[PDB]
Amino acid sequence: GPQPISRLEQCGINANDVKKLEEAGFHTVEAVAYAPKKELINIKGISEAKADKILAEAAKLVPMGFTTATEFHQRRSEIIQITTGSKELDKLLQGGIETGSITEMFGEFRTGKTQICHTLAVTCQLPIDRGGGEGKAMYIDTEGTFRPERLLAVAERYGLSGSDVLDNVAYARAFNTDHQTQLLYQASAMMVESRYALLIVDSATALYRTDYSGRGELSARQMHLARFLRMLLRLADEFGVAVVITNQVVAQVDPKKPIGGNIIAHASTTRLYLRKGRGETRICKIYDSPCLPEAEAMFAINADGVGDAKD
Amino acid sequence: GPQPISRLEQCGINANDVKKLEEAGFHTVEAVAYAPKKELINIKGISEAKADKILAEAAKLVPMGFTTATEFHQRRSEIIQITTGSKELDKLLQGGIETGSITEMFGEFRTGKTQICHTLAVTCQLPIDRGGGEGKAMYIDTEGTFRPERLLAVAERYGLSGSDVLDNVAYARAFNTDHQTQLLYQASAMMVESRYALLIVDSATALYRTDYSGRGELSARQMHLARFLRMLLRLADEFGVAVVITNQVVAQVDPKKPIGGNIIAHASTTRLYLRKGRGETRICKIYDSPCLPEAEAMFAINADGVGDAKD
Amino acid sequence: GPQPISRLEQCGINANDVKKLEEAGFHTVEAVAYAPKKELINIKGISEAKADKILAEAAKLVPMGFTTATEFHQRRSEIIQITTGSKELDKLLQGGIETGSITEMFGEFRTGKTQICHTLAVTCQLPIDRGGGEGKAMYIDTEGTFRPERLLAVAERYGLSGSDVLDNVAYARAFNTDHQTQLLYQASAMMVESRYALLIVDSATALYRTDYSGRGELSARQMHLARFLRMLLRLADEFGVAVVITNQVVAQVDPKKPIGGNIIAHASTTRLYLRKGRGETRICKIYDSPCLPEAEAMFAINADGVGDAKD
Amino acid sequence: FVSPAAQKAFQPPRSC
Amino acid sequence: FVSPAAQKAFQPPRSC
Amino acid sequence: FVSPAAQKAFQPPRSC
Ligand SMILES: Nc1ncnc2c1ncn2[C@@H]1O[C@H](COP(=O)(O)OP(=O)(O)OP(=O)(O)O)[C@@H](O)[C@H]1O
Ligand SMILES: Nc1ncnc2c1ncn2[C@@H]1O[C@H](COP(=O)(O)OP(=O)(O)OP(=O)(O)O)[C@@H](O)[C@H]1O
Ligand SMILES: Nc1ncnc2c1ncn2[C@@H]1O[C@H](COP(=O)(O)OP(=O)(O)OP(=O)(O)O)[C@@H](O)[C@H]1O
Ligand SMILES: [Ca+2]
Ligand SMILES: [Ca+2]
Ligand SMILES: [Ca+2]
Ligand SMILES: [Ca+2]
Ligand SMILES: [Ca+2]
Ligand SMILES: [Ca+2]
């Protein structure tokens, strides 16, 4: 796991500074190591002398140098892939939703974005034997569409204590774009204590369409969104959780591309495009991925969560 | 190859100073020769008297004067051009990715930037007979999208020991813009020992969009990026490797120009603009080059790396 | 031509001093005549007594007094104007690139700055009948983008021995700003022996963006650039060559002004602003000139060098 | 803040 | 730092 | 320094 920031005091850092760091969001040694010198300067009780000391000491505790692809292929083969509750869909993702990375699921309305996030919020607690993550879930919701009764329906499918599953889902309703980012700083604190295995922001860009209106606020909208997506990438490296954000769509009138622009297209590693099939069937499609080939699968929304096409 | 800095002691330089130089990034006689007098002064245990001695002695070991275009056309005709794994694409580049220079590959998401870097990281190890570089690869990755399983898929195509290919790729994950530059100083050390033939920074400008926010930090962003691109150009001259950086894009709302501004447009010698074709086909295009004509080629991403349009 | 400095010994100067002058950059009587008394004092084995003698004797050998505009209009009408390889472009410059003066070509990337310098480096060897300079070329390159294969392509157009043309281009790669200036002292030596007709520094200000970082080094950056541009102006008067420097651009964020500031705007006599036209066409524009009117022309980059819009 | 139950550590979901 | 295998020199990739 | 060919004087480029 990640080393807590308290281990910096044992290396020659004033316990007052650690408190000044922990008031800035940093809670692990990694979070301070990965941080630039610029960020630590922006802290009040920190100067360029301290920041150079903090960065130097923290760098000794976490590897930040070169290795070999062999040593990386080894460490990567032991990465957790959470099942989506669909044999047909996991065969598309070659295992399931991959941890330590940002995954994006966009599509028109009803295409099952929120439904996949509810299934993931349950199956991330199964033992790894059964294809899960053996951890809690963190469901940031910017729409008011978090339904606990949909988590119970999936727990019944996998035979889990519905009362116990709802204890492992830390729910938080974001009301604007500033609050949505504030919830991530509090999120970095919780993941140090417990063991969360899945972070869900649905929808990640819902509140950016309205808080930032026209083109006159376009530049500020993407720069604020870029910091959010960057702060998610930091959580994926600090704790090795799985970040699964959902995205809305927009028509092109010159036939539905996702919003967020190039800021969210480059940041996310895996993009899933969900269409409407027939009846209760849907069609997921590898829109972008570093490793997976471009292909389509057909899942469906059933009364017990996301599952294979029951037909 | 490049002469190691230890050859300065045999010319009247205190072995203590060489240690004070090697603690500043310089590891070859070239790195000290190409360096300005200003940089050596900025070192602590070095004064204007020593620096004038160091520059004078080092200049005797490496040619830094005029020649003729005839002597340069001869020395250039023996330059290595790494194949891209696509006959249609190499015919566009008139040989392949050229060493001793900075090449840039920008485009929207999914356009195969990371995929080309994975193919290059493999084909740079083929013997020159087969169109490679007969050297190791160095893959600095600022996004977390380095997949070793994509290197094995390309090794199977060219019939190479997948276990041996992954031993020649020195991978390093940069977490911010300061760390991204720090990795280049450590990179100059490794290239003295082994024989690297390809340096890959993907993405070179990913972390500059978020570490430096608005326009208020624009000036500092480009000056920090200019030093990075300059430090790459130094590696291309020290060791004659091939620098292949990838770049993200941005929309112009006044229809996708690359980021980085004029700082990265002037610095890079070859720019490749990658579009999305149809299905799995992509369209590369000589955006800028000193010698190559403006033209387009059509490659594709296949299950065995980047290859010709398998259609 | 220019008188060599050896003619000072025949006028009562110690042949030891001439050796002490030639070790300071001066190789012609002009270079010593145009020099201030301050520069000769800065030489070690030279005192105020000698310097007054050296300046007095040298002034007798070269005219440094008043004349008439009639005698100057006569001497100017016999000045050489090198063709740019484009009838449409030469009609803009009213003859071509004018010798005995500093010409600047700035613009965004790909706008054909390096391409014009390659065409000029060839057409400066044509006989004056065909519009050239009947001399060698000197191509100082601070970017690594000197391609001899682009000189051969232009020699084929004008029907010249491609092997002989590459013998008349003295190429030199500058690696920093100190080395860039050092190459000019060695340049003044070569021009005394042979007959160079064109000096090219491309790019003249590329290395000044990175060697001198922020505003804290701004003053030192321009004073170092002012000496360089002044040392070029001296070569244009000593030998009557044609100095053609290229310049990068920078955006103004308050839409692309050239870098270098007022130091390079006043120093250069002719400034050419190169835009991107359509396809392979470009648009040059008299940005500043003492005589030429403000106007635009349209040239293009062809497989045989810079030429008229082949459309 | 943090809930009095969100601060509780993970629990392996018992079967049913 | 440097890996105990990254410091190793280049090896011509054997065929298969 | 100077190349053994850069020190050579100018040559009118012969036709071809
Ligand atoms: N318990 C259930 N059993 C079966 N189908 C259900 C159930 N609950 C919801 N659905 C169906 O799933 C779809 C809703 O999907 P979901 O809530 O994921 O939408 P979404 O993609 O998040 O949409 P939006 O952009 O509006 O938020 C609808 O077709 C709805 O009829
Ligand atoms: N093994 C594979 N076989 C076939 N296609 C693949 C394979 N792996 C990835 N792809 C495809 O290649 C594309 C991904 O390209 P790549 O990873 O180079 O993106 P990129 O240009 O780096 O994007 P970004 O800016 O998001 O990082 C997608 O279309 C994906 O479907
Ligand atoms: N042989 C050729 N035939 C046709 N077009 C060419 C040829 N070589 C280069 N070009 C084109 O000329 C342009 C390159 O111009 P040039 O090398 O002068 O750039 P530049 O202005 O010096 O740029 P930078 O600031 O990046 O150095 C590109 O559009 C390139 O496609
Ligand atoms: Ca929803
Ligand atoms: Ca992406
Ligand atoms: Ca990528
Ligand atoms: Ca360029
Ligand atoms: Ca150029
Ligand atoms: Ca002027």
**DSSP β-ladder status, B296-302 and B281-288:** antiparallel
Label residue B150 left, alpha or beta by phi (over 0 means left) and psi (-120 to 50 means alpha). alpha
A71, A293 contact by CB (below 8 A): no
A272, A285 contact by CB (below 8 A): yes
CA angle in degrees (0–180, nearest 5) for C68-C69-C72? 90
A53 with A89, same domain: the answer is no
CB-ligand 3 contact for C19 (6 Å cutoff): no
CA angle in degrees (0–180, nearest 5) for C297-C300-C302? 155
Q: Which residues contact C58 (CB under 8 A, 6 or more apart)?
A: C8, C29, C32, C33
Contact A69 B178 (CB under 8 A): no
Q: Amino acid identity of B130?
A: R
Q: Which of C114, C70, C111, C116 is nearest to C93 (CA)?
A: C116
CB-ligand 1 contact for A112 (6 Å cutoff): yes
Give the end-to-end CA distance of chain D in Å, rounded to a whole number.
Answer: 33
Taking the CA of residue A166 and the nearest CA in chain D, the distance in Å comes to: 10
Which secondary structure element, helix H or strand E, spans residue B218, and what is its range?
A: helix B218-238
Contacting partners of chain D (3+ CB pairs under 8 A): A
CB-ligand 3 contact for C119 (6 Å cutoff): no
Q: Is the dihedral of CA C41, C45, C48, C52 positive or negative?
A: negative
Q: Which of B221, C251, B252 is nearest to A219 (CA)?
A: B252
Angstrom distance (rounded) from CA A18 to CA C93: 67
Q: Which of B300, B115, B109, B277 is nearest to A104 (CA)?
A: B109
Contacts of B136 in chain E (CB under 8 A): 10
Contacts of E2 in chain A (CB under 8 A): 65-66
Name the closest-CA residue to atom 17, ligand 2: A290
Say if residue A6 is preceded by a cis peptide, omega within 30 of 0.
no
Smallest CA–CA distance from F1 into chain B, residue: B65
Angstrom distance (rounded) from CA C208 to CA C194: 30
Contact E2 A66 (CB under 8 A): yes
Angstrom distance (rounded) from CA A72 to CA B146: 9
| 8-state DSSP, B221 | H
Coil, strand, or helix at residue C57?
helix
Q: Which of A263, A242, A292 is nearest to A101 (CA)?
A: A242
Considering only CB atoms, B34 lies closest to which of C151, C176, C279, namely: C176
Place of tokens 């329906």: A153
Angstrom distance (rounded) from CA A218 to CA A205: 13
Which atom of ligand 2 has the smallest separation from the CA of B303? 3
> C-alpha dihedral over D4, D5, D8, D14, to 10 degrees?
160
Residue B221 CA to ligand 7 centre (angstroms): 19
- Torsions phi, psi of F12, nearest 5? -60, 115
Residue C248 CA to ligand 9 centre (angstroms): 16
Q: Which two tokens stand for residue B286?
A: 């000589």
| 3-state secondary structure labels for all residues of B24-56 | CCCCEHHHHHCCCHHHHHCCCCCCHHHHHHHHH
Angstrom distance (rounded) from CA C291 to CA C276: 25
Q: How many domains does chain C have?
A: 2
Resolution of the PDB structure in angstroms:
2.8
Angstrom distance (rounded) from CA B256 to CA A256: 18
B180, B202 contact by CB (below 8 A): no
Q: Which residues of B touch E (CB under 8 A)?
A: 125-127, 134-136, 155, 159-162, 164-165, 167-168, 170, 186, 189-190, 193-196
Tell me how far the alpha carbon of residue C46 is from its chain's centroid. Answer: 30
**DSSP β-ladder status, B256-258 and B242-247:** unpaired
Q: Which residues contact A244 (CB under 8 A, 6 or more apart)?
A: A97, A103, A104, A105, A116, A117, A120, A198, A199, A200, A201, A202
Angstrom distance (rounded) from CA B290 to CA C150: 9
CB-ligand 1 contact for A282 (6 Å cutoff): no
Contacts of D4 in chain A (CB under 8 A): none
Q: Which two tokens stand for residue B241?
A: 């490797």
Contact B148 A65 (CB under 8 A): no
Coil, strand, or helix at residue C130?
helix
Contact F6 B63 (CB under 8 A): no
> C-alpha dihedral over C26, C27, C33, C38, to 10 degrees?
10
Which secondary structure element, helix H or strand E, spans residue C253, and what is its range?
A: none
Beta-ladder partners of B171: A67, B139
**DSSP β-ladder status, C249-251 and C196-202:** unpaired
Binding residues of C for ATP: 107-114
Contact E5 A70 (CB under 8 A): yes
- Of A73, A104, A126, the residue that ends a domain is A73
Q: Which of C104, C93, C89, C308 is nearest to C199 (CA)?
A: C104
Coil, strand, or helix at residue E14?
coil
Identify from B124, B128, B164 which residue to disrupt to test chain E contact, counting E C-beta atoms within 10 A and taking the largest count. B164
Residue B168 to residues A107, A207, B102, B275, C114: CA-CA distances in angstroms? 41, 46, 21, 30, 37
Angstrom distance (rounded) from CA A66 to CA B187: 9
> C-alpha dihedral over C140, C144, C146, C148, to 10 degrees?
120
C305, C119 contact by CB (below 8 A): yes
Angstrom distance (rounded) from CA B199 to CA B196: 8
- Whole-number CA gyration radius for chain C: 20
**DSSP β-ladder status, B296-302 and C101-107:** unpaired
Angstrom distance (rounded) from CA A223 to CA A244: 20
Residue C235 CA to ligand 3 centre (angstroms): 28
A110 with A173, same domain: the answer is yes
Place of tokens 């003698």: C53
> C-alpha dihedral over B46, B50, B55, B56, to 10 degrees?
180
Residue B153 to residues A80, A106, B286, C233: CA-CA distances in angstroms? 22, 29, 27, 59
- Torsions phi, psi of B309, nearest 5? -60, 100
Say if residue B203 is preceded by a cis peptide, omega within 30 of 0.
yes
Angstrom distance (rounded) from CA B166 to CA B28: 27
CA angle in degrees (0–180, nearest 5) for C258-C262-C266? 100
Would you say how long chain A is, in residues? Answer: 311
Q: Which of C189, C290, C289 is nearest to C239 (CA)?
A: C189
Q: Which of B188, B115, B164, B204 is nearest to A66 (CA)?
A: B188
A202, A246 contact by CB (below 8 A): yes
Contact B266 C206 (CB under 8 A): yes
Angstrom distance (rounded) from CA A280 to CA A308: 11
- Torsions phi, psi of A171, nearest 5? -95, 145
Name the closest-CA residue to atom 10, ligand 1: A301
Name the closest-CA residue to atom 8, ligand 3: B291
Angstrom distance (rounded) from CA C156 to CA F5: 22
| 8-state DSSP, B304 | T
Neighbours of A136 (CB within 10 A): 25
Residue B252 CA to ligand 5 centre (angstroms): 20
A65 with A126, same domain: the answer is no
Q: Which residues of B touch F (CB under 8 A)?
A: 63, 65-68, 70-71
Coil, strand, or helix at residue C59?
helix
Q: Which residues contact B261 (CB under 8 A, 6 or more apart)?
A: B222, C251
Beta-ladder partners of C283: C275, C298
Q: Which residues contact B210 (CB under 8 A, 6 or more apart)?
A: A226, A227, A230
Which secondary structure element, helix H or strand E, spans residue B102, and what is its range?
A: strand B101-107
**DSSP β-ladder status, B81-82 and C196-202:** unpaired
A165, D11 contact by CB (below 8 A): no
Name the closest-CA residue to atom 11, ligand 2: A293
Angstrom distance (rounded) from CA B176 to CA A174: 28
- Of B45, B73, B101, the residue that ends a domain is B73
Taking the CA of residue B89 and the nearest CA in chain E, the distance in Å comes to: 24
B107 with B25, same domain: the answer is no
| 8-state DSSP, B296 | E
Angstrom distance (rounded) from CA B124 to CA C288: 48
Angstrom distance (rounded) from CA C197 to CA C136: 6
Taking the CA of residue B56 and the nearest CA in chain F, the distance in Å comes to: 14
Residue B260 CA to ligand 7 centre (angstroms): 12
Coil, strand, or helix at residue C251?
strand
Beta-ladder partners of B280: none
B65 with B80, same domain: the answer is no
A248, A203 contact by CB (below 8 A): yes
Coil, strand, or helix at residue B197?
strand
Smallest CA–CA distance from B288 into chain C, residue: C110
Ligand of minimum distance to the alpha carbon of A275:
1
CATH of the domain at C112: 3.40.50.300
Q: Which two tokens stand for residue A113?
A: 């974005």
A5 with A136, same domain: the answer is no
Which atom of ligand 1 has the smallest separation from the CA of A116? 18
Q: Which two tokens stand for residue A141?
A: 């919701």
Angstrom distance (rounded) from CA B160 to CA B125: 10
C134 with C162, same domain: the answer is yes
CA angle in degrees (0–180, nearest 5) for B106-B201-B150? 85
CATH of the domain at C22: 1.10.150.20
Neighbours of A115 (CB within 10 A): 23
Q: Which of B221, A279, B162 is nearest to E15 (CA)?
A: B162
Contacts of B67 in chain F (CB under 8 A): 3, 6
Q: Which of A250, C266, C250 is nearest to B226 (CA)?
A: C250
B90 with B62, same domain: the answer is no
Q: Which two tokens stand for residue E3?
A: 């890996």
Smallest CA–CA distance from A62 into chain E, residue: E1
Say if residue C101 is preceded by a cis peptide, omega within 30 of 0.
no
Give the end-to-end CA distance of chain F in Å, rounded to a whole number.
Answer: 33
A119 with A228, same domain: the answer is yes
Q: Which residues of E touch A (CB under 8 A)?
A: 1-3, 5-6
Place of tokens 């145009």: C34
For C182-246, the DSSP string reads HHHHHHHHHHHHS-EEEEEEETSSTTHHHHS-SGGGHHHHHHHHHHHHHHHHHHHHHT--EEEEE
Beta-ladder partners of A171: A139
Place of tokens 């321009």: C222
Name the closest-CA residue to atom 6, ligand 3: B293
Neighbours of C230 (CB within 10 A): 11
- Of C50, C73, C96, the residue that ends a domain is C73
B162 with B252, same domain: the answer is yes
C245, C204 contact by CB (below 8 A): yes
| 3-state secondary structure labels for all residues of chain A | CCCEHHHHHHHCCCHHHHHHHHCCCCCEHHHHHCCCHHHHHCCCCCCHHHHHHHHHHHHHHCCCCCEEHHHHHHHHHCCCEECCCCHHHHHHHCCCEECCEEEEEEECCCCCHHHHHHHHHHHCCCCHHHCCCCCEEEEEECCCCCCHHHHHHHHHHHCCCHHHHHHHEEEEECCCHHHHHHHHHHHHHHHHHCCEEEEEEECCCCCHHHHCCCHHHHHHHHHHHHHHHHHHHHHHHHCCCEEEEEECEEECCCCEEECCHHHHHHHCCEEEEEEECCCCEEEEEEEECCCCCCCEEEEEEECCEEEECCC
Neighbours of E9 (CB within 10 A): 9
Residue B95 CA to ligand 6 centre (angstroms): 25
Method used for this model? Answer: cryo-EM
Angstrom distance (rounded) from CA B102 to CA B171: 19
Taking the CA of residue F6 and the nearest CA in chain C, the distance in Å comes to: 6
C30 with C130, same domain: the answer is no
Residue A128 CA to ligand 4 centre (angstroms): 28
B249, B107 contact by CB (below 8 A): yes
B188, B31 contact by CB (below 8 A): yes
> C-alpha dihedral over B275, B278, B280, B285, to 10 degrees?
-30
Residue B64 CA to ligand 3 centre (angstroms): 26
Q: Which two tokens stand for residue F2?
A: 């100077």
Domain carrying residue A221: 74-311
Neighbours of A19 (CB within 10 A): 11
| 3-state secondary structure labels for all residues of C139-177 | EEECCCCCCHHHHHHHHHHCCCCHHHHHHHEEEEECCCH
Tell me how far the alpha carbon of residue B260 is from its chain's centroid. Answer: 16
Q: Is the dihedral of CA C169, C175, C180, C185 positive or negative?
A: negative
- Torsions phi, psi of C101, nearest 5? -160, 160
Angstrom distance (rounded) from CA B269 to CA B274: 16
Smallest CA–CA distance from B166 into chain E, residue: E13
B138, B274 contact by CB (below 8 A): no
Which atom of ligand 2 has the smallest separation from the CA of B116? 18
Tell me how far the alpha carbon of residue A80 is from its chain's centroid. Answer: 14
Angstrom distance (rounded) from CA C294 to CA C291: 9
Would you say how long chain F is, in residues? Answer: 16
A156 with A169, same domain: the answer is yes
Contacting partners of chain B (3+ CB pairs under 8 A): A, C, E, F
Considering only CB atoms, B68 lies closest to which of C169, C175, C186, namely: C169
Name the closest-CA residue to atom 13, ligand 3: C110
Q: Which two tokens stand for residue A276?
A: 């409407």
Angstrom distance (rounded) from CA B205 to CA B174: 12
